[PDB]
């Protein structure tokens, strides 16, 4: 079995920026989720080989995870906050697509997403 290459975290052709909102996304939003007790499944790409999920990447064609997001933020990969917020949303969405209501992993995602929403509610404007 094989995992796909992970999402890129640097791109020499992609314009870079660090806005005050992107700084907040790294230093407040990502940091807060990363330290949460339920962060661990989301700190790296889904390893479909080690988790024995042979259909994961048949179903999920836009993978995302907080390890990737963290590196993107550290590299100033994003131009704007919305790109980063979209990556968080993709990560959560993938979990809900692949898994089922009431699954432990879904409950964990929901708790993290609630915290995510609380923190981005106060993005500096
Ligand atoms: C750090 O990477 C992982 C480690 C482990 C793992 O074996 N352990 C050791 C045991 C440990 N538990 C010990 C018992 N304790 C009560 C809770 C903690 C948790 C960590 C398990 C999963 C890991 N990564 C992981 N990535 C993405 C997933 C996913 N899993 N889960 C939960 C999924 C499982 C099935 C299908 C999909 C997923 C999934 O969507 N994601 C995001």
Curated annotation (Swiss-Prot):
Tissue expression summary: Ubiquitously expressed.
Post-translational events: Phosphorylation by CK2 disrupt the intramolecular binding between the bromo domain 2 and the NPS region and promotes binding between the NPS and the BID regions, leading to activate the protein and promote binding to acetylated histones. In absence of phosphorylation, BRD4 does not localize to p53/TP53 target gene promoters, phosphorylation promoting recruitment to p53/TP53 target promoters.
Outcome (variant: residue 104 to G): Found in a patient with a neurodevelopmental syndrome; uncertain significance
Top-level taxon of origin: Eukaryota
Localization (cell): Nucleus; Chromosome
Cross-link (Glycyl lysine isopeptide (Lys-Gly) (interchain with G-Cter in SUMO2)) at residue(s): 58
Site (Acetylated histone binding): 99
Note: JQ1, a thieno-triazolo-1,4-diazepine derivative, and I-BET, a benzodiazepine derivative, have been tested on tumors with success. Treatment with GSK1210151A (I-BET151, a I-BET derivative) has strong effets on mixed lineage leukemia and promotes myeloid differentiation and leukemia stem-cell depletion.
Biological function: Chromatin reader protein that recognizes and binds acetylated histones and plays a key role in transmission of epigenetic memory across cell divisions and transcription regulation. Remains associated with acetylated chromatin throughout the entire cell cycle and provides epigenetic memory for postmitotic G1 gene transcription by preserving acetylated chromatin status and maintaining high-order chromatin structure. During interphase, plays a key role in regulating the transcription of signal-inducible genes by associating with the P-TEFb complex and recruiting it to promoters.
Domain notes: The NET domain mediates interaction with a number of chromatin proteins involved in transcription regulation (NSD3, JMJD6, CHD4, GLTSCR1 and ATAD5). The C-terminal (CTD) region mediates interaction and recruitment of CDK9 and CCNT1 subunits of the P-TEFb complex. It is also required for maintenance of higher-order chromatin structure.
Subunit annotation: Interacts with p53/TP53; the interaction is direct. Interacts (via CTD region) with CDK9 and CCNT1, acting as an associated component of P-TEFb complex. Interacts with RELA (when acetylated at 'Lys-310'). Interacts (via NET domain) with NSD3, CHD4, BICRA and ATAD5. The interaction with BICRA bridges BRD4 to the GBAF complex. Interacts (via NET domain) with JMJD6 (via JmjC and N-terminal domains); the interaction is stronger in presence of ssRNA and recruits JMJD6 on distal enhancers. Interacts with NSD3. Interacts with NIPBL. (Microbial infection) Interacts with bovine papillomavirus type 1 regulatory protein E2. This interactions may serve for the tethering of viral genomes to host mitotic chromosomes allowing successful partitioning of the viral genome during cell division.
UniProt-recorded name of the protein: Bromodomain-containing protein 4
Full-protein interval shown: 42 to 166 of 1362
């Amino acid at each position: 079995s094989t995992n796909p290459p992970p999402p890129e975290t640097s791109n020499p052709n992609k314009p870079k920026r660090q806005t005050n909102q992107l700084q907040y996304l790294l230093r407040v939003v990502l940091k807060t989720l990363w330290k949460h007790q339920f962060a661990w499944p989301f700190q790296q790409p889904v390893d479909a080989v080690k988790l024995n999920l042979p259909d994961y990447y048949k179903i999920i064609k836009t993978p995302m995870d907080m390890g990737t997001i963290k590196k993107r933020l550290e590299n100033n990969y994003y131009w704007n906050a919305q790109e980063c917020i979209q990556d968080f949303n993709t990560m959560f969405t993938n979990c809900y697509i692949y898994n089922k209501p009431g699954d432990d992993i879904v409950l964990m995602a929901e708790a993290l997403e609630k915290l995510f929403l609380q923190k981005i509610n106060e993005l500096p404007t």
